[model samples]
Target: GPDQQFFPLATYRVGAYASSGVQVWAGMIDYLNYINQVEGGINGVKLVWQECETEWTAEKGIECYERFKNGLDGAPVAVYQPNGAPAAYALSERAEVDKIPLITLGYGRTEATDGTVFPYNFPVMLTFYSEASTLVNYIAQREGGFDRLKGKKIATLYHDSAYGRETLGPLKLLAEKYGFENIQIPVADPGNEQSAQWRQIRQQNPDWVFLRTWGVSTPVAVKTAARFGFPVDHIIGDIWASSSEDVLPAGAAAKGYLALTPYPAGSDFEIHKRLKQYILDTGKSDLKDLKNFGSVYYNSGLVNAAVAVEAIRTAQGKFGKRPLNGEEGRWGLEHLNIDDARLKDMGYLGLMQNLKLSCRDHEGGGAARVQQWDGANWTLISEWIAADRALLRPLIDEKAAAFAKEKRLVPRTCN
Candidate 1:
């Protein structure tokens, strides 16, 4: 019997936020589909995935999850990557309760990085907390390190969502750690109209402004900042704030704005070229319009899909091919590693890092670097900055243990 297996590749495509975030979601799934089409599956096992749009509601996300829970005749799923903070918040408990692995690529609850409480969840690469820390670190470099932050004023122009708000706890912590003051300004959804926020930004005259936004919010922030005569160099975007879609709209005004990147920019990789050629060869996509294929955001989706697929390969070697569930994939993810040499070999140049997951630390001590948009492209502005793990680890353990205690769940032993 030629066995046909099903994989659940779920994403919150359409939501209150989807119109803004759908490109990144489509980029992720398209990469996964591209992998299955190109590699013929991982380790001789092929995957057929079902794409269900959640439209961005927690109820719809939950409903979509239930619909695909069976995995084509009750076969287990290998992994899940939910989009945005709300879906991640909703799915975190489900993945934990069901023992399936949920990977939120730098998006999700800041607390989930506390592996002891959310062992089944992996905030792969860096996260909002780490990104915030990196932003503060970058600002520190601007003013002679730790001493520069004293009595400085920093403003956060953030989208009012769980995703945007996640930076508050971290930024607040950073503000306290240094001697800086933080002001948070919230932009309501569909952040197109930001005249008021920029007017406040112009008047308050903060030293630095951080954008905790995505999709249209990002470019809107940039354009508004530029229009208000705010120094673009003084503003940095959270990771989700950096995207081709975001920049294409802002054009040169995006120059000097910064972001925390898990992967490097540019899409000249063999895989990217191949994808372009595939579109041309099959006419499935218009290569003429595929200019952004290998940009920061889309290629990030490629990197995510590649690593996710590799994690599945790692697990099947241990769990066998009969059918693995999310739990099995969690083990695979926890043990997965993608190093610098591997990235270079994979044609990533020095864009990415080696990821080795652990039972209690899903991020694998991952580090981030700051990038500044130099009018036309992004350039490295800071060295690899590791989160003060010494500062964050104990806090994470305490938080995770407290959460576990509240939920009546057991915390895992950390390595």
Candidate 2:
């Protein structure tokens, strides 16, 4: 207990989103356990954690954050990952005040990518804005070329929330640039009974439908699309809706459904085999069923934990080999450098792209791939596609600067 690093996870293991939640949580915990079993923790310091149920709600997430901000052993909490976007938005200010790093990864407000304004918030992977641009790029490629998108119509069916709405600006901007008709539709939360939404989509007859829903709503949207005679192959689910939990519920109907992913899916990756041998097979992991071993959501959790662990490892280089406090951990996170060789050596061979984190670029402008479900497995349909950051960075800078102005705070100069 003297040499331990504590991480707190605000997760929803039992909720409408539980299907997606379970796999991600499993992957995160497994990685944490694997570190202890294989590496004996970070420089011999064991990692400890507590999982609090947020039910994907902001209020509960804040409550959990308050309960865990102070470490069990009286040191500051090493890190806090409020998995939901709403919670990430709500907890952003408190994280800055408390000095605990808030690792939002992919789902928080897109402007959080500007670390100068939101020093404590780290959307380490692809943000929603980048995701929207990537989706537009995929569609343009599918329709032959960007110029060919002139007459095509693309519709987005998103949950009616801040998380769902974040991508619309990028989509609209891209739509205008590419000369395509962009139709935005909002589905109420819990997203069941979407006959009305699908009916509109059916009548509009868009060339492609992009999904931005989660939980039971995902499978429901897929099934409803099929029921309303929309081509499943033409429907594309974003990162949140692109998991085995999303497709498995819809069964064969979900076959040929397309989705975008930050990481590759399934257990065929070298990392999975290593995890199976070193942790899963050895009875050291809490995951009894290895069926969801390499799912998109599961691999996402793995990446999430990997970034956190790597940050801790990097901090140890300067702070000496002991438990890292919030400030040291933030410095480490802000300076992450996970290159290709390091990725291969870490057992993630050919699974992810190299990441370079900095004070200005917390999201690191990572690329993603497009995967299509062939009923049984998700096959990569395209190579690593970079987000259109040329168009995105200016927007992030503008929004972040505005936020800093509203808060009346000076941005940090990390150099």
Candidate 3:
């Protein structure tokens, strides 16, 4: 354990969103365990992690970060995985002050994509803005073209929180650009009673309704939409909204549900095969259910963990083969370059698109695909779609610059 890297996970395993938390955490831990069990850690540095339950609350997540930031071994935590967008938003400024890298893989402040403005924040993959643009692209492609979207209406039932409302701006922009009417329907937190929302959506008869609610709220929305006789196929769930917890809870009603994803689900990849052979088969995993092994959220966790570990490897190249501190970890994350060849060597050939992070671009060219649920499992129905960066980058720069001006922090120039 001389070369040990400590990672603090702000996880939620017991709460209303526990179902969603469990699947994702399972994949995250599995990847960490896989590295330890199979590859014997990254370049001989044993990966060590301590999980502190956040219950998906920003306050509790911060408490966890404070408790585990220095870790038990007194090594500065390598990185902070604030899984919730709310928690990430809360810690955005704190991370910069602490000089700790905050890895918000898919869910966080979309403006953090501009690494120059927020040097310590890494929205590693797709952000909400990119996701919204990609979702609109899918809708346009399905409904013929952007010209055909003139009279189309899209309703978004969001969680009425920062995380849920994160997609609103980009979605509204796309609506304006495509000549569609965008309706906003906000649902209070712990969204259980959505009958009124679904009734309104049905009455509006939007060509497509986007489910931006997560946790138990997701299934409830899906079931209620089905009960209201809304077309399941047209009722699209966002990444967070579409999971086994979402579909399995609603049973048959969730059939034909579509969602956008940055990674594929299920254990079809070479990495998953290795996981099964080394970890699950050997009884090294605590994932007894095994039913949600290769789910969207699970795969999301897998790829996220992979990226984190790769950053550690990348950091070692510069900071030497020793325990990395927060600053070194941040440098590693900023310079991470995971190409297809590296992906193949890591057994993640087709799991996700190759990512190359830089000081100027932390999101690595947002790319995602659309998947549809068939009541039994999810099937990929579209090729990888790059987010509309032409429109996205300007917005990113504007929002990020606003944050920089508000904070009185100057941006960094990367070589």
Pairwise lDDT winner, candidates 1 and 3: 3
Model 3, position 178, has a per-residue lDDT of 85
By summed lDDT, the worst window of 10 consecutive residues in model 1 runs over 1-10
Model 1 spans > 4 angstroms off: 1-5, 11-26, 33-40, 73-75, 187-204, 214-217, 247-253, 277-288, 320-323, 349-351, 373-384
Question: Which scores better on TM-score, 1 or 2?
Answer: 2
lDDT pick, better of 2 and 3: 2
Per residue, candidate 3 scores C-alpha lDDT tens digits across 1-415 of 4357886777888967787677788888888998887787888778888788898898998888888776657555777888887788888887899898899887787888888898889887888888888778878888998798899998988998887888878887888888899999999988889989988987889999888887778888889989999988997777777676667889999899988777788787999998899888888875757987887878888988888888889999998777898888888987888888998988887678878888888888487877899988889889877778678678889999999999899899764
Q: Give model 3 RMSD, 1 decimal.
A: 2.3
Rank all candidate structures by their TM-score, best first, as comma-separated numbers.
2, 3, 1
Per-model TM-score versus the true fold:
0.84, 0.92, 0.91
When superposed on Cα atoms, how far off is each prediction in RMSD? 3.5, 2.3, 2.3
lDDT of 1 by residue, 362-383 (tens): 7764567677887677777776
Q: Write the per-residue lDDT of candidate 2 for residues 158-268, one digit (tens) a residue.
A: 988887888888888888788899999999988888999999999999999989987778999999999999999999998888777678889888989999888779787
Q: Best by lDDT, which number?
A: 2
Q: Runs in model 2 with CA error above 4 Å?
A: 15-20, 74-76
